[PDB]
Amino acid sequence: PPSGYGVLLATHDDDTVDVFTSGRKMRLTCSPNIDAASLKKGQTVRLNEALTVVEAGTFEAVGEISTLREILADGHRALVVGHADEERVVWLADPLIPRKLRPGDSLLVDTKAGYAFERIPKAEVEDLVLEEVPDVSYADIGGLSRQIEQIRDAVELPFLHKELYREYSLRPPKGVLLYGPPGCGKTLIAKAVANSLAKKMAKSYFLNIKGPELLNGETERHIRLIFQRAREKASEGTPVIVFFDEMDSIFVVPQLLSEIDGVEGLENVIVIGASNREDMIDPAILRPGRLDVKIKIERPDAEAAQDIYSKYLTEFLPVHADDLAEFDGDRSACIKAMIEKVVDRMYAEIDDNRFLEVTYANGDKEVMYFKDFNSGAMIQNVVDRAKKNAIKSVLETGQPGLRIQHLLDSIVDEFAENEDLPNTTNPDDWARISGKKGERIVYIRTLASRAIDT
Amino acid sequence: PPSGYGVLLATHDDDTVDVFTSGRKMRLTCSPNIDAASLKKGQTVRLNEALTVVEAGTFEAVGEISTLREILADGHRALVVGHADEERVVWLADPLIPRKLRPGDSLLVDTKAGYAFERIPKAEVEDLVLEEVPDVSYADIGGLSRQIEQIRDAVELPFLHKELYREYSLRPPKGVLLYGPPGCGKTLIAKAVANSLAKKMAKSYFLNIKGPELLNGETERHIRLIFQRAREKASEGTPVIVFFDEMDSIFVVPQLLSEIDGVEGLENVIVIGASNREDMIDPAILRPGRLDVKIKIERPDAEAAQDIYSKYLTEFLPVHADDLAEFDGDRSACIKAMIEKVVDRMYAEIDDNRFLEVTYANGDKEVMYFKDFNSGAMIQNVVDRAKKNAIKSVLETGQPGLRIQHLLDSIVDEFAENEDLPNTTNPDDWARISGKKGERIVYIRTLASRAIDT
Amino acid sequence: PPSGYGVLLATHDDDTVDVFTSGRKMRLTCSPNIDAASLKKGQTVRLNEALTVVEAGTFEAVGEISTLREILADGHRALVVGHADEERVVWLADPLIPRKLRPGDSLLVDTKAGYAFERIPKAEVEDLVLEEVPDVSYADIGGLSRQIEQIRDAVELPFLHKELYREYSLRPPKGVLLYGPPGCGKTLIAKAVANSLAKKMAKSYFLNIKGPELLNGETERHIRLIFQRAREKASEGTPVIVFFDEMDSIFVVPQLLSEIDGVEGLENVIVIGASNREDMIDPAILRPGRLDVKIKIERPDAEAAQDIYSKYLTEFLPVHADDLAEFDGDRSACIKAMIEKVVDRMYAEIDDNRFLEVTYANGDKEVMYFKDFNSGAMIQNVVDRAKKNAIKSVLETGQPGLRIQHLLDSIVDEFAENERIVYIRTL
Amino acid sequence: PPSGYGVLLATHDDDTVDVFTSGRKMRLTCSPNIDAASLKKGQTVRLNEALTVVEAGTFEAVGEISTLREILADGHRALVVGHADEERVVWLADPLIPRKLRPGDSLLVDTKAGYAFERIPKAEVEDLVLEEVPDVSYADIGGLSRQIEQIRDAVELPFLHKELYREYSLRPPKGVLLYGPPGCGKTLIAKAVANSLAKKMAKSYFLNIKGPELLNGETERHIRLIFQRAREKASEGTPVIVFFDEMDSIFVVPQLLSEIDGVEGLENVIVIGASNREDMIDPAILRPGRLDVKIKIERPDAEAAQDIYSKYLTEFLPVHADDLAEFDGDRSACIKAMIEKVVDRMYAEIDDNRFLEVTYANGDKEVMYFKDFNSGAMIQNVVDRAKKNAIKSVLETGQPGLRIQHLLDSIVDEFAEERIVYIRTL
Amino acid sequence: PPSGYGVLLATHDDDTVDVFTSGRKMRLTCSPNIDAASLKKGQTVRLNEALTVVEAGTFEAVGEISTLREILADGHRALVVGHADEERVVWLADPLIPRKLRPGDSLLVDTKAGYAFERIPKA
Amino acid sequence: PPSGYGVLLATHDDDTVDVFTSGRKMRLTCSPNIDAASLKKGQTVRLNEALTVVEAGTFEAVGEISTLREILADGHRALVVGHADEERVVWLADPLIPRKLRPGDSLLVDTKAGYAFERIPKA
């Protein structure tokens, strides 16, 4: 009735079994009751006090853990390492020779028995593969009609009209790379095309990635995971977009290059780029075939000014009754007039708006203005400061609403705030302003005035 | 009788029990007096010299203890990390399978048997970095009304008018960052505004953190516990304020952005920074949604120096009757004239007050007075030193009161000991001086004379 | 009967041998059935209840594994280092004493037995060199009539007619240099010739090397891997073709020169290199055996433009319903006539088509036109932008069929995206 | 008759107890003569080949030591932590359940049977905290008047005039740090200021400490004990001085910072630091609030060196008969003349006075003299060696006194005993 | 007559002795020749298959080396530390309980029986 | 024929040899043919079921290599440091007790038997 246990290590044609038990690898004459085939390399076996097996059973469920490094060329042996970087070679259990082995996983081993019994799974859930539901639509974007229609043609049409591309044998673009001065709104349309796709379903899926998010193991882990998740979410027949913001994190590139060249195995996914620096990106990405379509986003002009302001300056916000009486209580007409006035003033070439003095290679001097270095984020800050001044005035004085003078003060103030604040210069802006004359620059200063690093 | 002791692993239909005993596994037969199902999995049991179970008792209460990492799929196995990162998989205990299992706990185990027995409770002391009564008030800072109003706009206004922002659809900024040369008042403005808003409850918190102690239970876990405490205290509905003094500890920056974006949903939490250096801060922090307003604290000018002197030389200190007779019983005007005299000598552009000579790369030179290298801490260090000189004058003469000559000597002294101290300097000083002159600096000379590195 | 196992130490002439078992070393006799000399030093053996060796077996295949630090001068012992900085002197197995012993190997060791068993080597398996199949032959190559047959003579002919070259005793040009403006089919002709050789074994090793791939130790080990792989690939005698891309980044030079000189002596190796910037090409790479044929690829003329446009404008694409009546259902005639019209539009020397004005030292403002600055990539941009405009048109009107006016508008839209010369200014 | 040994585990009502023996746990019935109540959980017991408890015994006095981490709610188990952080849960011996068990204590435990056996007192002589009455006055210190006045202002003026500082709202400093070249009277200035403040009481303490003593039981315990003793000795209101000579050895630092920040509330405490390397000190210590006042003591100049030589040579100097005639035998002026001539000689820019050479990184070579490498300790050494060599000479000749060349010989031997690219001594 | 070895731990006046051998400490009878005073505390002793101490010799001279931490108040047991930071309380040899014992010394120890032998000199 | 192995530590005038075997230390009688004076110390020797020394074998050639720290003045004791900073005193070898050894050399020792065997040359 009492009985010990052992683990099989080898078998012979003579129906004799090698068993590890009592810390010793003995050879045993198996009982004729059981067969010679159901015995498994790594199978626990009962033993009698006469030291003879009477049963072949299950596999060990508890023991030392290790990480698999290599499967030996023979195929029956695995080279693994332990807790304190102790490394050993073991054999494999029959279940190991319910998923197949992937070198780099974890195994359950008994070092004294020298046998691995089970691939033990360790899983960590990553939030990067989690999709994102975009929030802002094209009604929140202004002064980008040409570029928004370009992105419409280059992104939403292939998903909506795959069959038209098929019958015309036109390969849809695979990589779109936006570029523009910082604060123009690249991210806005980049994450609003996903809303456009979601609304254009007569199930869109977006997955955002940030450079600082993937600038920290190392970063190359998540690229394969996100690409595979996109491949899975695309093979089901649904549109999907992977978005890479701030390509400046890239120049590692070659793995991404290989993956994007393999992306041609898929036909309903586009990687969308975005950057403030065209130069700093690795040009191999920009080579046609991987990232083909380029779209420039421009600093808003005078026309785009009132258009983008109207987006922030809705009729919802309170306005002082004097302004309403100025146009007989017509909110639309009065707000249109005031936004026209403020965009004219901010785009006017008054002495306050004087920003930059250029020192060309031939010494040509021009007094530039903030109206030439404007951006969307500047408009956001301006309207925010206008609202803050208006609410302070309402609190202190009592009358509610908004007035033009608030914006007039905010616009003249905010230039000083952003003067010391960074992103006030860009090499592309210098190149664009110098293209008219064709002369380099070595001296830059503002016009309150501060120097610039050139 | 001489009886052994083992631990049960699992039962069997044949009324046979697997038991770990003598350091190895065996299979035995229980007594007919006991029921096999009555045995509990992973329970101690006694034996007889005939190797037969007679009865079983409670679970072993001592032995090894490991750290719970995860619970396996079927629930009868757990994966636990050892003392020296010695990971092993073990079975569970029947009482362990109300007070359920939670990953991250500890388990009483025996390595050889591989059977957990208990989950001991452990306690951790709270970090005690909590609210402090804000001692400094607005009336204790001089010559910063611009920054006073800026911080009040950014922090004080929102909670007083929570619904007013929703009236104008203004998203309140959360990250308010301070900076400026050392010894200017940044550490005090945060406490002052906390005191103001607390007094504005006619029921508010504050969480000071300094740079050193977060270089010293793990730093990431420390920040995590600070942030969860802040969020759960803000959940009460009252406004709360967080304050990372000396963000030069932050550049493991990554996690911090994650918690800031998490608390972005919260409506009553603020992140407030402080630093003498803007460069060493991680630029990823300086983006909208994260730290928004880059309020700059500047070395006080002549008027602000007069104010901050007036914040110390109050009319409630012993004033010498000699100068008092010059003003006929009015201590206020006497100490006022004291203040103008001392500030005039302090900011005087005389040869004594020459501090630095700035030699630029072009070769030009610029003599610098202490007025441009002043600070807010030096005013403390000179007023208190003058008071100490008054004490020693009283000791050596017996005449009480304070005289102008004390501060007159104190100014030249404070310049004397700090002649070897570049603590008044900051990279922004060189940058702004080069911008003002238009030439990059190459050499530094003070007027003893020293050449601090360029 | 039940029995254990032991590990041999060293034999003795008295029908006995030292053997380690049960955690200690004994001296045991062996059965007369076996010969002690036949037993290998370190061969695992079986025992008995009487504690006597019965027969041999196989060497233990599992245990600890250690980095062989060095081999002792005795020729049968060696010092190895364990995982925990432990250093042990151990014996050596008979198979270990023909892949010789070198420092840094990984050896199988049992600490109790103190015996090395087997040198498990690391498997440095990499795919920095791979075989890739061609995509399209010259059948889709447009406007390169005279640029393909000489390539066929250069590389395709020598393998098929080796006897003629043996009679001539003439070495085929192992390298042909390709250069010109970007987007002129430099890779396309290489792919075409690779496909043609892949259709002429009625068995083709093609290797592609990229400049970024070279930029991936330093470049020496990489390029050595590619060149040696080419060596064993050409060893079999199967025709081998190698390609190199945009060598402007290259020319280190001497190591590449030595490698290509070494591979020059090989018989059936052919390598073709192409690069855009001919001017910055080092003449040293042009030495005999290397690339000696320099073929200039230039911007297409009217007929080459016709051919290349017809290559992408196959009759399998829809044609405007209204314009079908003009050609009476002849879709091919409509397509070719419209291609003629569009090619004339690009090649029209009108104010619209002006590209660049350059003032030389002689005061001439030579007006450049897109007909002088056309390329295959530019043509592809033309055709696919026109096709996208046609898709938008049919979407907004519901009438299928590619219309010429869409191509005409594409022509104007597409051109806003891309004596010694002294002044340059685009028009 | 031979008998083994085991460890008791628990007790049972049926004349049976569990025993750990030979590495395994068993259940055994004790001999009837012994009583179960007598046996204590964890008491070593005597076994036999019959496997029966025959009589009780002592408790184990060997094994491993593990630091207690927590005491469980069961009142019989304490989660202990091993040598290399191998925590275990063990029973507690009855003598451990008078003195009480506390977190952080050291216990004697056996990993084999998991039973704690006793606590271990980890103590020391604790004589480092023994305050020393100062024995050096300001008169023994010379050439440091600039430092004398300011250290006087820093230290005793707040103590003697706490109220006077009070009506001026001036918060007195807490930390005073001293720094300079080695052997510059730092310990002397500390002892002297202690003596001065001791005289100005009409029960102070000078807890003089040395650095390398702290590296030796654990440093944290010493730095805590000294400061609790300072707190209890300052609770009376008498002035207390806490002095850490050679502070450079430290940089634990965070414990010291937290402790001084906590204890600054007490108004009659002053900390004094001395070191040879300002840079090697952790910056947080020098932050205002902790170390308010900083003082530099530099190498003496010619006047200060003359003062020091006057300190070591009073009017009681035995002089040679040769020197008696020239100065009319007036020692009060003869010693002054000798000091003047020696300070003129040693400070002279002789090639024999070269000590170090400096090669600036901009191609400039400059040589340093003896004067920039003169310290009070070096003056002490040269004066003492001149005196002993004068004694040797007058014993080997017969005519007693002191001669000028003796110290000139003493000068050379003791002295013999932009960026910079290369340095050399000469 | 084969014979093993053991190490003394404590003595008893009942003609019996406490000796650690074969990885276990046990009480054994004593041969008539030896005496409690004759046997030396913490000394190697010859054993027998009959499990009885017969001959006590000189102290064994090789083993581990542990740097002494401190000497506990009782004076019979001292705290020493090991190479891997382990610390153990061990009994002292009679020569260690003349050249005095001070903290900071290296002692020859046999941690199996927790007995220190002598203060090894260092160069 | 089935015979064991042991290592010879010390000799006795009583014509009995100290030997370590089976994870312990015992002293045993030798075969009458061999003589203790002829029996040089240190050589591993063959045993029997009767636990009697039968023949004097050769030296050890496989063990643990460790850098010597110091040779003690008495000459038969050597302090040596192992892999994990462990420091222990061991005996010496017949060749070691004529080639010249230096501190810091690599000596082949076996920890339990505490006997050094030979200095392995370095590269």
Ligand SMILES: Nc1ncnc2c1ncn2[C@@H]1O[C@H](COP(=O)(O)OP(=O)(O)O)[C@@H](O)[C@H]1O
């Ligand atoms: N004869 C041709 N027929 C079709 N397409 C061509 C032809 N010549 C050039 N092209 C186009 O120009 C591009 C040439 O690419 P490649 O051969 O790699 O040279 P490059 O690197 O200079 O662009 C291809 O994308 C192809 O579409």
Ligand SMILES: [Mg+2]
């Ligand atoms: Mg953006």
Ligand SMILES: [Mg+2]
């Ligand atoms: Mg501050």
Ligand SMILES: [Mg+2]
């Ligand atoms: Mg090409």
